[PDB]
Assembly symmetry: D2
Amino acid sequence: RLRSTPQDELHDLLCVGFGPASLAIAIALHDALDPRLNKSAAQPKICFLERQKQFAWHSGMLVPGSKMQISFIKDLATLRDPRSSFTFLNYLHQKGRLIHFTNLSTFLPARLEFEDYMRWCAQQFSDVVAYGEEVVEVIPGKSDPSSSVVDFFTVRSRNVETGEISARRTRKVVIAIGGTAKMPSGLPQDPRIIHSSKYCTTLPALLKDKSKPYNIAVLGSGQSAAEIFHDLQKRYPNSRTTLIMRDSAMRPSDDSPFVNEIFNPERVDKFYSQSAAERQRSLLADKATNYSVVRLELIEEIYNDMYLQRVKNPDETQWQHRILPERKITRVEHHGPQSRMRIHLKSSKPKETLEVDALMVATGYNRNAHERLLSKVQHLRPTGQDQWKPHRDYRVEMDPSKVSSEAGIWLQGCNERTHGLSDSLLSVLAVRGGEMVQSIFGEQLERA
Amino acid sequence: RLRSTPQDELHDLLCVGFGPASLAIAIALHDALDPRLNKSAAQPKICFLERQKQFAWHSGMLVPGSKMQISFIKDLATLRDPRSSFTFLNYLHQKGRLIHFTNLSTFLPARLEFEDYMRWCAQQFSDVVAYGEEVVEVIPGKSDPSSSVVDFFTVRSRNVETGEISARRTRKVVIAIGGTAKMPSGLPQDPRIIHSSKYCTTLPALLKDKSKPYNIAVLGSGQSAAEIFHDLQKRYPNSRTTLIMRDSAMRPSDDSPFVNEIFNPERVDKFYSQSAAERQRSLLADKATNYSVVRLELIEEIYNDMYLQRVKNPDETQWQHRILPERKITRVEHHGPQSRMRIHLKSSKPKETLEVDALMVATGYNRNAHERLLSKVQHLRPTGQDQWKPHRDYRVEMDPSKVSSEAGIWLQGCNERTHGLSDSLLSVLAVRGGEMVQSIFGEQLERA
Amino acid sequence: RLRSTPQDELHDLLCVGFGPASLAIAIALHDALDPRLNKSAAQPKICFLERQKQFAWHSGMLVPGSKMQISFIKDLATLRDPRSSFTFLNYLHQKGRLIHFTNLSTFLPARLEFEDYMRWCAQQFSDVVAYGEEVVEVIPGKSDPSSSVVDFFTVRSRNVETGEISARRTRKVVIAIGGTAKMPSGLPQDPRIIHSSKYCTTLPALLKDKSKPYNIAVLGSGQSAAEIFHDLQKRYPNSRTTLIMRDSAMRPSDDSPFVNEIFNPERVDKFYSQSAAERQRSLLADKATNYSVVRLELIEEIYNDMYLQRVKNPDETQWQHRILPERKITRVEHHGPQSRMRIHLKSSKPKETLEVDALMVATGYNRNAHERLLSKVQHLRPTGQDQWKPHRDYRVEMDPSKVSSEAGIWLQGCNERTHGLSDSLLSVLAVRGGEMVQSIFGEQLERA
Amino acid sequence: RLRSTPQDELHDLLCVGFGPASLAIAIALHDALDPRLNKSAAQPKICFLERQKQFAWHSGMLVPGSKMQISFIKDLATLRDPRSSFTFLNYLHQKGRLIHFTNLSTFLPARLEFEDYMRWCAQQFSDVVAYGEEVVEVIPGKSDPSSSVVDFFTVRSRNVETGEISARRTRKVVIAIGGTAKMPSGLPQDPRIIHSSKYCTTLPALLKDKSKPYNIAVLGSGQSAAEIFHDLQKRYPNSRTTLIMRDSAMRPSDDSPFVNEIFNPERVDKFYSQSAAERQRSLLADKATNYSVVRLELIEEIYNDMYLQRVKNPDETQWQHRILPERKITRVEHHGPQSRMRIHLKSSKPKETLEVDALMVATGYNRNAHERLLSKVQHLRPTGQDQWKPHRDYRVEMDPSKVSSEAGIWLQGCNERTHGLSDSLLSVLAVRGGEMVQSIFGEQLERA
Ligand SMILES: Cc1cc2nc3c(=O)[nH]c(=O)nc-3n(C[C@H](O)[C@H](O)[C@H](O)COP(=O)(O)OP(=O)(O)OC[C@H]3O[C@@H](n4cnc5c(N)ncnc54)[C@H](O)[C@@H]3O)c2cc1C
Ligand SMILES: Cc1cc2nc3c(=O)[nH]c(=O)nc-3n(C[C@H](O)[C@H](O)[C@H](O)COP(=O)(O)OP(=O)(O)OC[C@H]3O[C@@H](n4cnc5c(N)ncnc54)[C@H](O)[C@@H]3O)c2cc1C
Ligand SMILES: Cc1cc2nc3c(=O)[nH]c(=O)nc-3n(C[C@H](O)[C@H](O)[C@H](O)COP(=O)(O)OP(=O)(O)OC[C@H]3O[C@@H](n4cnc5c(N)ncnc54)[C@H](O)[C@@H]3O)c2cc1C
Ligand SMILES: Cc1cc2nc3c(=O)[nH]c(=O)nc-3n(C[C@H](O)[C@H](O)[C@H](O)COP(=O)(O)OP(=O)(O)OC[C@H]3O[C@@H](n4cnc5c(N)ncnc54)[C@H](O)[C@@H]3O)c2cc1C
Ligand SMILES: NCCC[C@H](N)C(=O)O
Ligand SMILES: NCCC[C@H](N)C(=O)O
Ligand SMILES: NCCC[C@H](N)C(=O)O
Ligand SMILES: NCCC[C@H](N)C(=O)O
């Protein structure tokens, strides 16, 4: 069991964010310290800062009926050690549900179930996690101020409820803050225009009456757009929905066994060793495994609904739920006296008008939010560097004549270009957590 | 094209009922008269009497999302002649939907779609079908009244809208009236106790508010009980449902290829030729193909919903939707001042109380309604016979010294004991229709 | 790690057989003694006697391509404790194969793979397992010979290689010897007539040339008969095969979720508590889950091969591989001067002749071989008892005035009538092993 | 029924090739002339020239177990008219196999079965098909030699058995000759290097002994390469096989419903109307539907075999069957005194040596063989044209002042760039055949 470190003490590690990636590190550290699992093994002074009030995993996209797109074996522990108490199967055993899960004959739990698994995991680390704390900046520190050597970092976080800044000092920092909502530059700001990440949380507040005949539009062609589009038909039974996509069709995610091997934990070494050109070419060739793609079973379900509409009415323009392929939004009118916005559409090749009460935007995420937190440490990078360069062990490159060997900053979840498509996913977290514990607490736990 | 016969004329054939079975005969006759399909081929004087106001197929069980449990190839024509204009594939071509159906990659259309196919078929016979006519009795006739030989039949039908009796005379009669709702003898009569056959038609009238937290019970363990039970959770989102069954579990329908061969049109010969003991033993050994069984995909779907309830709440007694296996109803209290009935339950081996607003009873059908229509012709059977004995060609056995060779009565859909499990189904209708046309219009069309 | 007990010492436990059932006990004991898994925990003196020269699992039926009919989660440890080092997933991790297994997206490993898993398990108990030892009898013993109280058992085993009898004394005995080959009484003894259990081991010796056009017959309609029949077509490409069954068709195994719940470890309590009549009726109602049934995917594969034969030749009598349903063997001629036997066939209802080089008999197993080993202890049963009566904890009932409380005999794998259909299977072994350790070593390990 | 035209007579139509594409035209013409199907309808003088001795469909790739990659509904007639006697379902009915096919529950017949269907179709046109005739050139003709107007074409064909040239004159020509084997330019000519199209025909002649331990290599990553690679393991049980591909993995064919709509017969209009840039971009975006892709079920099967090899031996270099991704052939040594060639390999990014008895090359086809047959008619194209420009109705553009309106040349199966990915496939053949009959025999059959 991990014990709390007083705020005023110098930490060994401070992690920013407590989502899956950070939780995987916490679990890996527990396991590395467990004399039952690690026969070799003073507790390291560790703390996790999370802006949410309690543990949650993409709560705004927890659509009813939504399933995991990954095998349960690729949970937070199994691929590193199946004997771990933090496995999904052990979770089910602790819940009295293992025999019942077995009878489902599925590798893909509901997202709701997998979130509770991770919640059950996270709760066992409550003593070392500070919730309601949003990190605003990371600042370099010098134990000897008159020297020119940085040997610690001050991490400042704002309390979400109360608003005051708190400071914690640490030798090492991990940033695992996921991504920020990516919005098209052409779209204007409006409370009726909502990103996919806030679908379950903000949309019901805007459209209070669930029986009212609303017009709701969805922009995108990926898993989130398909999930939202399909869900709206259940959540708002009398609403007219529209899916808008640049591509000609919803295209299936590629989970075929040979292609799927790029997500193997050991393939991170092979991917990282490749040159920039070889890494850029590889990500593009395997784009159908993660980006702008939908699980085949969802596509088929949607297509079936589209076919039943055809049975009832051969006239496509009369359909309650429609898909408009090869379209882009030219302009949005949202200053009119009516409840609805006017969306203007044209061909996406190098058209109609829609009037809608709400526009759901499922255009993915940006993984650049760490830049804002690390502006004050940019000068510690090697001369001329304008991007953070993560090593194989995820430790960012810094000038060794400016930064002590005991001090470092690690990045997690934003290292796709260097580590592969599995970097932002749950695929390698169990193994990566294990690697991270070794990279950070290596020398400290070698003597045991 | 088949033309109408004036009511006052002597018919060659009169069919009672215009459901799938009778429709299959009509289609087979059209095809036998089509010089394009039948190279050998005065039109026979034919009329169909149907009690419904227009063509419908189990409308009270047309659950949204419900699928066919039979391959579309086993439609009303294909197995007899794929070149027929009455095939499901030709229907889709006429509707502009064939390419769209192909992309679904399914042999199992929605029940809604298949009903429209049969509707599209039936509408082409509107000139020879009298809707809104319920047959009340079949009476024997003698062209020479002083003789002791029956050579025609008078069929009397009551108009459902207006109530008056009409009489039509014919040499030959087909009875294809399906089955009547089978209700348990222990259950009392109550408007809150409804048979599965009236689920979509009468239940919404009883429970007007779709958002109200009702308690609704379902009795049975077959396809209809599972379909109703699963549907209620969608149709009444806030209702507490209960499935009550005598058996320990929902058991899957057997559609495995070798076992499924009993439904082959040619296997009717082999089944019919078997003795009474061999026929009784065969039906029991293949009971899992049709009776008290559910499509595996529906069972799995229901089980998944049951599992998600377990994820949210480990306490089974708190669940919104529950299944109570190995239970029987001992008594029903329905005279109380409250809106709900009290259902008392005990073990089905040789318990609780439920309070419900509605009880859905899915206990199948009886195939004995033809007996009431043929009471006045019973004396034409061979001496000592107290059951109607259908030949291989479905023509009931009558005393040849009392009934002329040109006169006869045929039975359809109630001949399971003699013809097999496929008799009540859509399995052999295309071929059976063809056989029926030959049996009835054989000598009349042999000269062509 | 479990250490060896000298032959001459009084044992706490002696297990007869080292198949899955006994291996599950060994694993459960290791786990109960592991202070990492069991926080409470002198080693108990234990020994396993196995007649085979090394660990094997139905080697004569290890057909190439054959799969497990059970989810890998129902391995030898997971359902009791997923943290165990003896889980299938931990096995794959130790073999460097876990990521590769995950990509298969299957719960059903090849029988070859699962056997190696169990081999990998068994090898860790080599110090407490005596291979090449066939138990011939269990004899009661009295530490005080002049008393009338039995407090130990002598177990005598014959060395298979050398032939001499060895004696080991123990307070408690487990008999987990599986089943003996069940052969029809009408069939005569012949080297060309081989039981399914010796298919992979004895048949290749009889039919040495794999390219020779043999006639090979298979008797049965279950999983083993289907597996052998399908395999012969690959193993002997030029041979004429024949499947002979009493039933009209191959019928599928029922693995539907609600019915499958009878295999739950907790349902053993509910099944055991039921009366003899309720237990007899329950086994018969769920017969399609284990007995005379074939995995649907195998049936479909076989049917497809049968269909391709029809494409090439419409004449069924000319087919290389044929299925003869509703047939029984009346007599077998095997004294003729030719290489082939003559099998005479008739209808199985209350016919042809086959000439074959080999007859494979897949008619299941008997679970009564323990009777022969326990004849000398029969007099210790309560007066009038002529069958062994196993308690819930599998300990057979004995007269408490004749047998001390520290002495007992346990049965495993033959308790279907009292414990359910899962008794002979791998379904509950993990949990049953755990229960067995508690029943046997309860008082001995309570002080820890 | 279509009757033969004497060789010396002027034909209305002459078709080059009698594969699926030409067969579809023949069937469409039969149907357009059938007064049963076409209510409006002297027979047109038509002849088909085919170089094979009898009807065959990719005989060199008729791998045992190989399935169709297209739904049977997309046969040679159904999508145009389901009432046609040339439908796959009618074929099965004529063969007595329709009920048996239904029980398979598959849209994908074996390639062997579908070939026999097309054979059964083709045989009904034997009177208008000249087999054993290879067309060597098409020459323009002038009924008035002194004029400057071409109004007919002479088609010259060489008899394959006897070698002499025959000439047939026609107003209109269709070229439906499929594609020629595409071979990499770096590979030298050798009898041990065989294209996929000659796998079933020439490889068994080269490797006579099926039990001999050969080394066999397969170059490619598409359906044919996967099929050959998987088949070799069955056909040569003791051989060491190697799959060589430039890509990192076998990638699955995309048959998802929305993407699959590009293969719709009506989408040919939409595709054709698009500009050259829009057509080039569309083919590339949907490349995963036809090119360098494998049916998912085959990939999974291959992967499973690869996994079983891992179970038996963790050492990948020791495996009997191996896949070498991201490799290209640099040089081939084939002049050595040994039976085997030496294949040198390097990385395909911008290595080992293999010694093999045979190299199977599955690198697709070229669709440019029509160019050689039309060299003498090139001058009839509009000035400056160096490529044949097919109209929507497939009629190539010619100078209207040089070619009469009654004379024309049509292309089939090579029009991908203008008509879409379905052009070379079986997808639109039924409809295209119908369109072709109208384009060619339009004015001739309008008066009926
Ligand atoms: C709808 C949806 C479904 C998905 N399903 C799958 C799937 O099936 N399989 C799969 O492999 N991947 C899936 N993913 C991908 C997903 O990114 C990963 O599963 C996972 O969320 C990665 O975890 P993370 O910790 O890197 O990022 P996150 O899960 O986003 O966690 C980051 C955490 O940091 C916190 N944080 C952010 N900023 C600050 C700050 N300034 N201060 C303090 N804390 C902060 C956030 O509150 C958050 O809790 C899915 C993504 C979405 C959107
Ligand atoms: C919910 C449900 C789903 C089913 N799905 C399938 C399936 O997937 N596949 C399958 O093979 N089978 C299925 N069946 C079985 C079904 O019985 C047959 O498909 C089919 O209905 C048989 O047709 P029929 O004409 O014999 O009987 P019916 O369809 O019942 O037709 C009888 C007709 O006679 C009329 N009639 C009755 N009495 C009189 C009277 N006195 N005078 C005049 N007219 C009268 C009725 O109005 C009715 O129209 C299903 C049954 C149910 C209840
Ligand atoms: C082909 C086949 C496939 C199967 N597949 C499955 C499956 O997928 N899933 C499933 O749940 N079940 C399956 N089973 C059922 C099977 O019975 C169990 O999986 C398992 O074998 C039960 O283990 P056991 O120890 O009870 O019996 P066994 O496995 O038979 O082990 C008994 C052991 O005792 C030894 N022995 C016997 N007599 C003596 C003696 N006199 N002295 C000393 N030693 C002796 C034997 O050599 C043997 O090693 C299958 C059975 C067969 C035949
Ligand atoms: C292994 C394989 C599997 C396939 N499976 C599918 C599938 O599942 N679905 C699908 O849609 N497509 C499939 N195809 C694509 C295939 O191209 C089409 O199915 C089909 O063959 C197209 O017919 P065609 O007439 O255009 O060409 P072809 O089938 O090649 O027919 C051309 C004919 O012209 C003849 N010919 C050639 N030159 C001359 C000459 N000089 N004189 C006279 N005659 C000549 C040839 O002998 C041949 O018979 C497959 C292709 C291959 C190689
Ligand atoms: N969208 C998440 C992709 C998961 C990946 N196919 C994997 O198996 O790891
Ligand atoms: N419930 C209808 C059964 C249909 C049958 N399996 C058939 O294929 O004909
Ligand atoms: N033939 C073995 C049956 C296994 C059983 N269905 C189970 O899941 O335990
Ligand atoms: N490889 C042939 C592709 C067939 C295509 N998916 C179709 O449905 O027409």
